[PDB]
């Protein structure tokens, strides 16, 4: 096999340190190279560094040297990334990746490129406080209705950190839904909207309800949206 | 340090067509140590090609890589719906590995103008002391759209944020939200709120407005 399983999400303040772990299970660990790659929100892949566990031969990208440490524990097949002096720009999904082999694996000849990936680990760096969202209705009116169609929604505002998930009528309404990616407001809190389009004849014979789930704050809220 | 440059930024094609993606390197990539990854929306990336032309087993025969030195190419011979995603190149021909900025391969459909809806702030929010006005541009293509806020015919600036969905899997359109945020008053110091919208699918700007009252 060879599966990589990383640790869970983190919320850190500027100036502090974070340690992310990656547990390999299925192949050999000592003689294959493990790298760390991150992806900042709305951006591409960036290579941070790697380690060959066998002699702890490290390799760090120049722009991280002094802030980064990569280790491996051969007795638990676990690699670790430590990043200190954290700053808001270090907000990203961090991946560990192991090189592939000719096999397809099948512990054979290493190929350099990254065949195996962890699920990713969200690290959010901010001076904001964990907070569940206020959920306000985007009520359907004459100004959001046209012909047979009407748009309604809910505004999921002032929450931290990511992510939130939204659903409608406990999932009874799926087609027509668009949930927008979140944006970071000036306050350092996130915000987003979820809308759906529905037959305007069913505004009197149907109640519409968004369900907002924000695990990082232990918050679960349900807003009834009703016409203006 | 080797800079990889992927072109174009986004490439629009129909299913069954042939895709060819480009990567050009600021220096020669040693021993053709160049790889290509695919990344679907909410997922980790997935290796498709290494050493410029080698394909791992399990990777579909649609994918192929070619090129050398300074100039590399990925080809997808017959685009399956699964293939419309982001593609990255990576060189590992020196210790400092680098990635290209990525290339999006979107589904090409016929132009669709935005359907525009406007939402005034809720009574609930106003009680808190802030007002958010939301403009919805639903189901349009291509993704480029300009949204402008006007309050009592005055053009707003720097108090709005927009967000765009990923391309819809069923109909291949996009949607956008623009959110205008004010304090309770001056939201009440003013009467008429409008968002005006520009898109290649329209000859005239579409404007959606309301007055404080309706409903």
């Amino acid at each position: 096999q060879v599966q990589l399983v990383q640790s869970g999400a983190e919320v850190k303040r500027p100036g502090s340190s974070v340690t992310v772990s990656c547990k390999a299970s299925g192949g050999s660990f000592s003689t294959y190279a493990l790298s760390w790659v991150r992806q900042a929100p709305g951006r591409g892949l960036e290579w941070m560094g790697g380690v060959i566990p066998l002699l702890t031969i490290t390799n760090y990208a120049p722009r991280f040297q002094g802030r980064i440490t990569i280790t491996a524990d051969r007795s638990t097949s676990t690699a670790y990334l430590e990043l200190n002096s954290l700053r808001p720009e270090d907000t990203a999904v961090y991946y560990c990746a192991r090189e592939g082999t000719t096999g397809w694996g099948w512990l054979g000849k290493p190929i350099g490129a990254f065949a195996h990936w962890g699920q990713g680990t969200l690290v959010t760096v901010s001076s904001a406080s964990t907070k569940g969202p206020s959920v306000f209705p985007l009520a359907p009116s004459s100004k959001s209705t046209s012909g047979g169609t009407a748009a309604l929604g809910c505004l999921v505002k002032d929450y931290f950190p990511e992510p939130v998930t939204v659903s409608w009528n406990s999932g009874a309404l799926t087609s027509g839904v668009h949930t927008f990616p979140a944006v970071l407001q000036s306050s350092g809190l996130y915000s987003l909207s979820s809308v759906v389009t529905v037959p305007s004849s069913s505004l009197g014979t149907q109640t519409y309800i968004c369900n907002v789930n924000h695990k990082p704050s232990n918050t679960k809220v349900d807003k009834k949206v009703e016409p203006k | 340090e080797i800079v990889l440059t992927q072109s174009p930024g986004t490439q629009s094609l129909s299913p069954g067509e042939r895709a060819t993606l480009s990567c050009r390197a600021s220096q020669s990539v040693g021993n053709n140590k160049l790889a290509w990854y695919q990344q679907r929306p909410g997922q980790a990336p997935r290796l498709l090609i290494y050493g410029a032309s080698s394909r791992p087993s399990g990777v579909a025969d649609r994918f192929s890589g070619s090129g050398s030195g300074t100039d590399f190419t990925l080809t997808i011979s017959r685009l399956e719906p699964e293939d419309f995603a982001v593609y990255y190149c990576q060189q590992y021909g020196q210790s400092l590995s680098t990635f290209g900025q990525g290339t999006k391969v979107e589904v090409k459909r016929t132009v669709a103008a935005p359907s525009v809806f406007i939402f005034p702030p809720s009574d609930e929010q106003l009680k808190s002391g802030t007002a958010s006005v939301v403009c919805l541009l639903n189901n349009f293509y291509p993704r480029e759209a300009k949204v402008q806020w006007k309050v009592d015919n005055a053009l707003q600036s720097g108090n709005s944020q927009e967000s765009v969905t990923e391309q819809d899997s069923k109909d291949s359109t996009y949607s956008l939200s623009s959110t205008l945020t004010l304090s309770k008053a001056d939201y009440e110091k003013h009467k008429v709120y409008a968002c005006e919208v520009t898109h290649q699918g329209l000859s005239s700007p579409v404007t959606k407005s309301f007055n404080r009252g309706e409903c």
Partner: peptide, 16 residues
């Protein structure tokens, strides 16, 4: 090139 090291290691572990 750091990315070439594990190849050297696989070539020695296969000759033993």
């Amino acid at each position: 090139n750091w990315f070439n090291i594990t190849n050297x290691l696989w070539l020695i572990x296969k000759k033993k």
